[PDB]
Amino acid sequence: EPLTAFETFLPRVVMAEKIQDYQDSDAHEYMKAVQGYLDRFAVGDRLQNATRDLLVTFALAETGEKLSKRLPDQRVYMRDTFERHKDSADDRSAYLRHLRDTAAFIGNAWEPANNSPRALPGLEASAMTDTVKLCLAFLNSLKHTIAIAPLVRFYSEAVHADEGEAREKRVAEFEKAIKAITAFTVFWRATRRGTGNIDSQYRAVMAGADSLTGIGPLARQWAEPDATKPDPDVDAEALKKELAARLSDPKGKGGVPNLASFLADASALPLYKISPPLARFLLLAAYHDTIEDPDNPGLIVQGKAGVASCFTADGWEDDTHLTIEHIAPQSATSGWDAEFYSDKETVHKLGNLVLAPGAANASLSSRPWTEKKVLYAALGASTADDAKSILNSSGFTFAQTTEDLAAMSRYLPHLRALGQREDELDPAFMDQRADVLLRLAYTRLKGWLGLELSDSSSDPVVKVDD
Amino acid sequence: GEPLTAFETFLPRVVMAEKIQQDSDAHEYMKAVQGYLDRFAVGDRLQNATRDLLVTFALAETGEKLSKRLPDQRVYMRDTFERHKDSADDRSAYLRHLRDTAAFIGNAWEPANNSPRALPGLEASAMTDTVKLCLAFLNSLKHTIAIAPLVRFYSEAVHADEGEAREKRVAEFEKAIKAITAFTVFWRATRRGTGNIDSQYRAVMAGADSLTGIGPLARQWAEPDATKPDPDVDAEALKKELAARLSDPKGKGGVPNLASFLADASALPLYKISPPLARFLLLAAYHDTIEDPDNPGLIVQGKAGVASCFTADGWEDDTHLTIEHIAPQSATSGWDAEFYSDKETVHKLGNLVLAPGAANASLSSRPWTEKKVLYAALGASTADDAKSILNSSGFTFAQTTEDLAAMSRYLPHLRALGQREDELDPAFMDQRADVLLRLAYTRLKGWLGLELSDSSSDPVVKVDDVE
Amino acid sequence: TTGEPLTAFETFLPRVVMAEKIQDYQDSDAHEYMKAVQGYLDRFAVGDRLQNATRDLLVTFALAETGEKLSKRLPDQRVYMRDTFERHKDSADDRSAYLRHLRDTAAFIGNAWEPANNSPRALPGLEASAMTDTVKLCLAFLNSLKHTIAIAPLVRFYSEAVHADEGEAREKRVAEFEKAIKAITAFTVFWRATRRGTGNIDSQYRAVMAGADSLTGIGPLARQWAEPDATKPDPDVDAEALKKELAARLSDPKGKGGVPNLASFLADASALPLYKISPPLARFLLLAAYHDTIEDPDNPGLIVQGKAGVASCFTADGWEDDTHLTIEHIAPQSATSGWDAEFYSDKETVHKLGNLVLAPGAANASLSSRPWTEKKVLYAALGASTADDAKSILNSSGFTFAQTTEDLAAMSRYLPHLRALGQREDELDPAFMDQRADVLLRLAYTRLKGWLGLELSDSSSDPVVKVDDVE
Amino acid sequence: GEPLTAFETFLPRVVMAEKIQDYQDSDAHEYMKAVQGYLDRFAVGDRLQNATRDLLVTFALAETGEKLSKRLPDQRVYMRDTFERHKDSADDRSAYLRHLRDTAAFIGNAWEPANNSPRALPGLEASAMTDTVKLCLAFLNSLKHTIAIAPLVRFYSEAVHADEGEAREKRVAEFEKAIKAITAFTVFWRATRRGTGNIDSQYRAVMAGADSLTGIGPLARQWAEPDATKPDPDVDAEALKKELAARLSDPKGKGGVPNLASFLADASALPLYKISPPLARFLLLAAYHDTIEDPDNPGLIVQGKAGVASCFTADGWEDDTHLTIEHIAPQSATSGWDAEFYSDKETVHKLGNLVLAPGAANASLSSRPWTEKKVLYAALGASTADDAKSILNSSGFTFAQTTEDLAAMSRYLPHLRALGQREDELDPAFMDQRADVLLRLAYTRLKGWLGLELSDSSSDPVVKVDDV
């Protein structure tokens, strides 16, 4: 098997310490850690793939990167940018520290080992807050590896920082950073058909350039080797405002200038087919602390804080109680308005999606709305007794026992709401539903990015396309 | 048809004062409480739930310690309702308080069948990891007495103005929950029975015999009438008061220094007394540990975040972290008979590990010689090393190599035991218990403001709790 | 893994690293302090020099942390080192101050005691002001005497001066360091001047570090207690405590220093061949004695205190000045003509303080083995105020010396003890040198006395037990 | 046969006071014998003449601040003039003579000690002879700054006359404060000006002063206008310090140096080594003291740990062999070197081009290409002689001296280590940056001696002014 660009770099990291002779040299503790992470992968492709992917994100993190997957190209760069630190002792030290930090992060925070939780090595478990846990989980699910580079940067700084006040400040900044990255990615991705090359945006941020804000590079060092000015990993506005603008500024390639355009873009796409993880993240954002709408029978509205909370790491992980389920079946089925199957994409838009217990699926699948209405009313009941009363009160006999479905019952307003809807369901209604949902989601993620799009609404609004 | 609860008897009474005036919003607080009770089936469940709601209510409004009997419950409600016959806003905040205790018991303490835990009116942020872990633990322990003080801090967090005020009171709620939990853990770990902890909490609520300058924790005074406001504080008041109740010679907590805590806890069959308590202690102990390079089979604190388990997740993780006995619970071969001199030996902290529950089929009643390989394997960094270890050994276990390797996880305390070359005796488990109880103490210490002297015997009475 | 033994320090390094599971290590405090110690050892070549340097660093370390005389043997050092690090397993800050202490002793040995090849002496972390004239003179002398035992107590005061807050705190501890250095030095000089061999001074210092038979109320001087565990604090204090403890050890009937009054000091010192025992000690005594002296108007061969600053030699400069102030014997070391045979009855006579002068070293070629009659002119000349009078004196004499008149005049300098001897008309005998020694030892005592807080009885005769160090 | 010095002419004039009868006078005799003592040191002829007239000159500055000429008849007078001022009082013609004793004492022991003796302050303990005092005396003497004698005698005289214990010590510490202030003032004035710029004139004013910028009056013992209504004394701690501080640094003053920018600009520009090698040396020692090689600007230095590399000391001053002033760009046009350096004949002599290096090595450094000088500095500045060997051998070069030999002269010297690390070629621009760094560090070190605090405001308020 071919030697990875990593093992080719170790001799180079040994000719470069004179002689500790190492190990006792520092590199050999940072470098041992990285080895620790790679040892996790079996010789052959897994070891190859893991190493080249570690190096790729490394390049983005030390300089805006875009280092290719090909091996000879990686053997360089490692060479290139170590020679940059031939002279200084402490600077070929911080560099290697940086490589340790990216392996630390990928291995523990991004893709933890088989049974372990997620962690930020060197940072306490307090740092591993609920929001941090939910974003890591989501970004990973989306396979958004590009987000690793900016994240390592804030992690690296949190570790290196002095204990007490310094560490905490940088830890809180890490959360601010993770939120901003996530919200930006969600908004960009919800509002576009494909990936629309988000990656290209992130690299530009890392490297700097095309900076909508006054802000400079996010990588550790400058791509142009030499120094006249410092480089700062700051997120309080810097990441936030820069990303905010990249999405929402006419000068930016994010084609989303106001609320009405966001709603129009997202409403229109088959989000479930594009990215089930994204659909799920949006649904959780939307349904969190909602209550059935007293005036619009199908709909929901924001309610008491903590009354129906799902927008959490636990909620993300909870496939068992909160599975994505289609209201209008994915396929033409009787008991349903044919309008829904004009466009193959209709059934997959946010408005048609609910979160329901996964087991019930056997009873919900391909049934007329008449049947589903009872099921949602039941599955959304406050006690299993009410579910029992609802299910029996109905004439229907479902695929599962009354006793069984009642067990799966839980307080879920969006389900209760749909159960109360007396009027028939059509694509027009799902569009209204999507609007309601996308608004609530926006209201929840908005703060993460510092967004405040015009809800001038038509008046002083230009419904713009990307 | 069946006999009416002391709750329904109270609603007429809440209406003759409403008092029309569906017309009254007080109905809204009262409607909410009804919401919670409707959850219980007519008969025993409805009766039990209502009388338990009222009991904690009494402690929270007053230190009353209201009995289980029904006629005695009809009485309180009228007793302490009339107290608020005159003022409009004061029979309002009172009812608000009853709403808050039902809100709390129903959502925070014992949530509905498939829902998470919540603090109604407080955001999901308030539902922090530590808050979630303590609620989970206290519930598991069935420590219902902790509800009364907790409602009090909840109630205040709700009632507080948005923004700065709410957050301050929310942070205080966490401080409070930690202090209550640490206090309960320390008290309970260090005593044979329940040692009447309850009596301590009620005293705090009232609270009699306050070691610190601090006054009652309930909403109102048990002696009906007012000259001064009622304290409801924690940042020292609850913390220091509880700290002292455990650790002060004047207090009934018989634990004056570290050496005595270690001596008391080391000696008890904690697993038999309270498996929940054993588990909470083990999680505290093992959190961010690394195998000891000098004392084989022992552990020491390590890098922050390297092996964290002291979390809500860890508490809930029965699948990866099950309590397992090192020396089998019963006399079995491959094991020193020393362990079965005292039927309590096997159940002391030092003999307990956290391991994946599935493996149990392979660990059960096996000689140490084997358990050593199993722990070494189950605690491995990769499943490849687990394979390497299991195969390397001669043994064939109840489960396939492939299977056990799958259960591998990085767990230093297991790695540590796998490296131990010397035979295991009760002397070693006692050393183990010492190490563990110290780490636990180090972790819970901050929750209570504790700082017991460890003089390493330096000027140290090793003191027993006093009959 | 090459050749000869691995030093205790290297063995210890692995242990110092295991003790830091959580953090760093590089970030670790230890591998900053420990890098510094490495700095000092790197100075020595592989083999004996590296071995010797390391084991000696560890020895003084032991005395300084716990007043324990750690042996030279390696296995004993590997162990001594582990023992007392495990004492600080638990606390972060306490295995930190401990390592700081090891840094401080290497800092001190390397810069203050035996500086690098061309560098001055320094107290790392302390300003150059701290490097006062007296500090410089004592370090120079103690080093010359090879009094390595003094390193342990000295590190202790240094360590505290560094660790102290800037401004008032640092200065107070720096001034205490000088007080300390004086006391150590004066005590060592008095003990050693008054005894035949080393009389085991070392044993005294170790007792102080540990002490342990403390004549004063004073407790240990080491950082920590040899008996591992703590109930009470330990002080490195110098002025309230140190002078007094040392003072008593020399001068108290309960103490092993056998020197209870002035008359016994004078009797003990007068009698020993100090120059043979320790030329450095003789030199330090002579400088103390001759400092600010003037020829005695009433006794021809002798000297008395004079105006402040008139003829100062008791200084770092004076100590270093081998060129102008070399120890020279008045009666030649061997039987030579022109000299009374009395001087060679006892082989030790010629080497007692009274027979020693400080003179320019070059002149030696002209002074060597010459009759007194000549040496008299030479001293009179070499001690002259101007080189003109020196020429006046040398020419005025009939003699032709080994060096030209012009040459010797060039070395002429104002030196009363030389002027005084040149005026002595009466012949020189051992009786006269004894009187000389008395005068000298008194002046020395008067100068060093303050350093130690001493005030010995000169009452006697009226009341003088002239006591011997034995019995 | 040669003319009688104004001193011997003054003894007849002195005895009349006692006059013929007493001691006689015993006190005066003791004082005279002491001054006579000092003069006896000089050979009859020119040396005796010169020494006596110079003793009298500084005496005049110290007693009346009068700038007495070198000519003899003018000296026989003033002596006469100012003794008749004390015809009446016994104790006042006593303190006067005491003052003359003190100036001879000072010149003879503190300023120019006898052939092999150390420096001393007669009547003051050896403690008084502190390191800073020793370094300043040594420097001022080297600079030939005889004008500084007058103010210094004044503080000495007062330290002697003062009661033992508290009084003496206070006046002794004041003598150090005084010596620092005089020295710093002289260094700053002289570093910043082309010629001597008549510093002397400044000092005289202070003694008689006279044109005071501060409220302070004369520094001499007595008033030049003979008669008394008020006492004359100056504490330096405010007075000498503040007065001198202002004379250098005040728009009203003839010192044309109002801020840091102007100081740096003035000093950077002058061929200091050619103007005054002693001054260059004093500045270099100030600058290099406790420095460490700059991690960002190679070849540059920055302040470091206290006591890591101390050279600003009496020992350092005297240490010619270890710390000799050496030019980086050779004094003359040589190959291996940028011709830029020889545009202006003065360039090579500016502070930035000067290092302190062991004097013996000179045989290996002289007129060599930089490429070599770089290795040599790196080697000579090494921490151990092993590293010096490592460096010298590691280089291809063979120098005038053996590797073994040069390694021996090795000493820890950051400014040398720093230059050894410099990869970029050397030009006049670099030496200017170097001079800036050095002059700043020197300023930071001497600043406290004078109570100075010049605006480093310049980017905010640069100015900056020239002198005159």
Automatic annotation (TrEMBL), chain B:
GmrSD restriction endonucleases C-terminal domain ranges (all copies): 318-408
Top-level taxon: Bacteria
Official protein name in the record: DUF262 domain-containing protein
Shown segment, full-protein numbering: 333 to 801 of 820
